Prior knowledge:
- This is m7GpppN-mRNA hydrolase.
- Belongs to the Nudix hydrolase family. DCP2 subfamily.
- Mn(2+) binds at residues 49, 53.
- It comes from Homo sapiens (Human).
- By secondary structure, the chain is an alpha+beta fold.
- It has one domain: Alpha-Beta Complex (Nucleoside Triphosphate Pyrophosphohydrolase).
- It contains 2 helices and 7 strands.
- The chain has helices at 42-54, 134-147, and strands at residues 4-9, 16-21, 29-30, 33-35, 67-72, 75-82, 101-106.
- Strands 4-1-6-5 form a 4-stranded mixed beta sheet. A 3-stranded antiparallel beta sheet has the order 3-2-7, with no helix packed on it.
- The chain starts with a strand and ends with a helix.
- The structure holds the ligand CC(C)C(=O)/N=c1/[nH]nc([C@@H]2CCCO2)s1.
- The site of the ligand CC(C)C(=O)/N=c1/[nH]nc([C@@H]2CCCO2)s1 has 6 residues, from loops.
Amino acid sequence: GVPTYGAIILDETLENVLLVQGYLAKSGWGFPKGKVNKEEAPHDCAAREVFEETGFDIKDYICKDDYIELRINDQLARLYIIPGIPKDTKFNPKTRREIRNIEWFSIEKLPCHRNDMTPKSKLGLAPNKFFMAIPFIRPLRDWLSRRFG
Ligand SMILES: CC(C)C(=O)/N=c1/[nH]nc([C@@H]2CCCO2)s1
């Protein structure tokens, strides 16, 4: 699978994260990210995708060693951690044919797993609008505990 790159943007209090909502198969909330172009460096891909999806330029704030990376279904997604961005920043996608909405979310209120259906004696997981973000939540909380406190 082609690698994807993006960002986890936090505010100045470290208790809110910026998520974006797409359409159709990307109809829920997730971190801004996308697929790398041929010959494009990881940091340049992350900045390009975040600016296309949010209108905010991270290039002068990326730190090379500060990211969370996951391999899901043999595809690799790497999100650079960007703290300290003011909550009154004006965010605007480049293409609203791809992005429905942009919002801050409390990290402590976000889910870190989906719920089962054991009350119905049925296998699988119940739907949740944060499905694309959920895999990053626990590793982000653990990263923030080790780096800050
Ligand atoms: C109404 C809208 C915000 C919403 O929830 N969209 C979803 N689309 N995909 C979902 C399911 C559950 C997780 C796996 O796929 S949830």
